[PDB]
């Protein structure tokens, strides 16, 4: 009599809204995948789990108000900057509003992915163009190798990955004048300096290279933590650059999400809904 | 007549970019040839001067004044119990409207679309965090943010489309301690900024609010306010508060005796106050 037409056991799962709530509260993947015998039992369970997550979130915030005095993104930002200053890197801060011409020299499709302000101005989608400019200026006053980096807000109307941030923080460190034979090792050095300062000790370096060049993608498992490029590059011509170089770029909110193992990348980004990884309406 | 030959428009602007002393900017000469020769001498002097300043950045600091002041200010405030926050630089049209004294600022911002724009000030975002935090923590709540703000126009001769604001506030300040709290903030900020000479000018001209202005002579260092305020209603704020805002590149220009406020702002033509074409 085991024919049974009935449905499998624990077939009632979270409603999309319960699921989203548990995610904002950084529930575990196990908790997110829980099934129940029926809706009432599930709703009941939901309330209990939410309750515990809200409690944990409030405790975390206490730490912020009496101890840290600043959220992870800002703590991470100061942490990364000091570590690079100790390695001789000069930190710069450039315009977040860049021109269409600057943007053009970077490739098209990226034009449809940026927030335009008018026909000639837009919010920078990356830090590269601005650092290219500083390279050209600094190379005329300083001796190579020139080490420069910037940590700052970038904007994109859309992106890859399963999640998206219109406003994100990028760390982009570079060295202009790197000896060709040492390029691959510099990228490694940079990755290590950064990942070490970021409290991440588990990661792998993925190198690829095909036609228009040699790229080094830093990752943890199937998780990308950063992408580095190498010069001479195809674009070097438009920016009047002719020295070898290396550059590595990181998404800090993404780094934080991966290090902390949180659910939403928004949890530690610039926000009015979260603070230091905690959803505020708790 | 004697020394009645002055800098040409071009020579004046160039010297201005090089952050000439001002005295140098008013120098006169006996003739047009003696002037140009003086120009060349003074320029190369300022250029050499700029190159050495960049050496301090290259070998000593490793970061420009704006970033140095940012870290210095933040820590100073962390020491006084202020929690630092970082909010969106893109705000809604609805939020901007709740800032309108009455029911103007719209032609001052950069719109991304009919509903979004670049924040021209930090207040709306702080107003929000206030409401949220007050439900989790007991008053007084002390928070601040240092971040980029945007405006198409502003008061004064000089203008930055991109500028850095430090806005520190306290929600729950005892009504009778507001003025003192405003002074406490100004002192904590300016001491950390390297500026000790300053006065606070209260206006109290209500129907607009009990404002305050931090001055360094005829120069403004910051602008502040306090609640209850007629705007608190829209933001569902019911407690007394104090707030003070500082434009960091302006603070820097003032402390360093710089010519263009752009010299220490986000830029591709300047760096740590030094014009890059040498
Ligand atoms: Cl506009
Ligand atoms: Na993404």
Automatic annotation (TrEMBL), chain A:
All copies of the Aminoacyl-transfer RNA synthetases class-II family profile domain together span: 75-258
Please name the source species: Desulfitobacterium hafniense
By its UniProt entry, which InterPro entries does this protein fall under?
aa-tRNA-synth_II, aa-tRNA-synth_II/BPL/LPL, Phenylalanyl-tRNA_Synthase, Pyrrolysyl-tRNA_ligase_C
Ordered alphabetically, the record's keywords are: Aminoacyl-tRNA synthetase, ATP-binding, Ligase, Nucleotide-binding, Protein biosynthesis
Can you name this protein? Pyrrolysyl-tRNA synthetase
Q: Which NCBIfam families match?
A: PylS_Cterm (TIGR02367)
Gene Ontology biological process: translation; tRNA aminoacylation
Alphabetically, the GO molecular function entries are: aminoacyl-tRNA ligase activity; ATP binding; catalytic activity, acting on a protein; identical protein binding; transferase activity; tRNA binding
């Amino acid at each position: 009599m085991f024919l049974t037409r009935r449905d499998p056991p624990l077939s009632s799962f979270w409603t999309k809204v319960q699921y989203q709530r548990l995610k904002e509260l950084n529930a575990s993947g196990e908790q997110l995948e829980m099934g129940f015998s029926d809706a009432l039992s599930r709703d009941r369970a939901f309330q209990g789990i939410e309750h515990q997550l809200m409690s944990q979130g409030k405790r975390h915030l206490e730490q912020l108000r009496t101890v840290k005095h600043r959220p992870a993104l800002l703590e991470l930002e100061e942490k990364l900057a000091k570590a690079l200053h100790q390695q001789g890197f000069v930190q710069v801060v450039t315009p977040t509003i860049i021109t269409k011409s600057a943007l053009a020299k970077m490739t098209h499709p990226l034009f449809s992915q940026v927030f335009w302000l008018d026909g000639k101005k837009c919010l920078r989608p990356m830090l590269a163009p601005n650092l290219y400019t500083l390279w050209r200026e600094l190379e005329r006053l300083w001796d190579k190798p020139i080490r420069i980096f910037e940590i700052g807000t970038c904007y994109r109307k859309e992106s890859q990955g399963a999640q998206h941030l219109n406003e994100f923080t990028m760390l982009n460190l570079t060295e202009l004048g790197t000896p060709l034979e040492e390029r691959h090792q510099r990228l490694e050095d940079m990755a290590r300096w950064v990942l070490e300062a970021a409290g991440i000790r588990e990661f792998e370096l993925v190198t690829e290279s095909s036609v228009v060049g040699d790229t080094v993608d830093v990752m943890k498992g199937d998780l990308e933590l950063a992408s580095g490029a190498m010069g001479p590059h195809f674009l070097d011509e438009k920016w009047e650059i002719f020295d070898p170089w290396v550059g590595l770029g990181f998404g800090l909110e993404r780094l934080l999400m991966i290090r902390e193992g949180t659910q939403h990348v928004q949890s530690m980004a610039r926000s009015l809904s979260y603070l230091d990884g905690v959803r505020l309406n708790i």
